[PDB]
Design a protein around this ligand. Sequence first.
Ligand SMILES: [Zn+2]
Length: 416
Amino acid sequence: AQKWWHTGALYRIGDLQAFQGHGAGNLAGLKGRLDYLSSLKVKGLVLGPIHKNQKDDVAQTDLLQIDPNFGSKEDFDSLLQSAKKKSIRVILDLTPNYRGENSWFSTQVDTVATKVKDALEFWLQAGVDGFQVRDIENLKDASSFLAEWQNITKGFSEDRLLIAGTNSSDLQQILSLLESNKDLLLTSSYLSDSGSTGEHTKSLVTQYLNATGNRWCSWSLSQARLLTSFLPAQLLRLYQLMLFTLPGTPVFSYGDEIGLDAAALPGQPMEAPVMLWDESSFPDIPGAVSANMTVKGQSEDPGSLLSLFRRLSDQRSKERSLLHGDFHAFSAGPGLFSYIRHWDQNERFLVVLNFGDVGLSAGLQASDLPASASLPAKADLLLSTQPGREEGSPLELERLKLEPHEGLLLRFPYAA
Ligand SMILES: [Zn+2]
């Protein structure tokens, strides 16, 4: 088989109460939204933290005890049972001081690291499929601890994950964390540089793959915050296509599927903005929310961001070329970022991303590829970020017009 986090996207649910809002707001309530997460084809949701934590006090913090606000232990057990019946894995966040500004209390670790050791051993027997920990740059001897905890996690089963998260975007600071245990997923702000861009992004990704020996890894804009925090509205489709087709596991926060924005909801945290299911989800200020900002409204419109997300995620899970990590990038025009995805004699995929505000001709040439480059004269358009095109019918790779901010996803058989 394939280990489970390779087969789909990860969905981060930081605040249980903002995610479902009124009525539910529980572990028992989260149970009712599983069929929805299935419609996003997420193979693992990143849950919590949900443990007891008195703001900035080590003694008054216990990772083995759930906070009554979120429910009970039987609610959690009940949640795991249903989730496994629906092929949905659950990753628990154990960031200790998640109510204070320093997530690891201070540079005095000793007592804090011991607590984390016991929690892993405890919650794996309760049946969780992995763990997350954030703000590692504030942890003394970070790489040493991530090595040990990774070994406990993999020891239980090889089909168990550890995710670590940093706010840093420096490449050398990121690699030094990875020099510890190379099978460890690391989310970061490495990609976060919108507005002024060009083909800066193309290099960033190939440089990272270059340095890491092309090992399996994660793709995100941050450890916890939304896409809208970093990107302008009219770049969300482009980045969504990219994250869903780059070699590795893509990681989103709840709300990225509908383009959820912390601003535009006056007086609300950038961490835990309320999820928008329909018109009644935001009562505080009535008219501020509209139908096209909601799940309900975007479920109707085929042109919506939610529609793009669901279709991209369906490909990412079903198709084998996007499930394994075989990837090659073109040397096209100065705005573009194009690449090929393939595995054995399965169906091949071609991506083309225009980052500028100007129309382009995609002159994607053989230019630096393997012997398995041999592109056809024609490939079928599966999907475009902009409505208008004839989806399903063949285009021509030499003569290829790209409108500002457009993204194309093209399919073709192994034998050209
Ligand atoms: Zn290849």
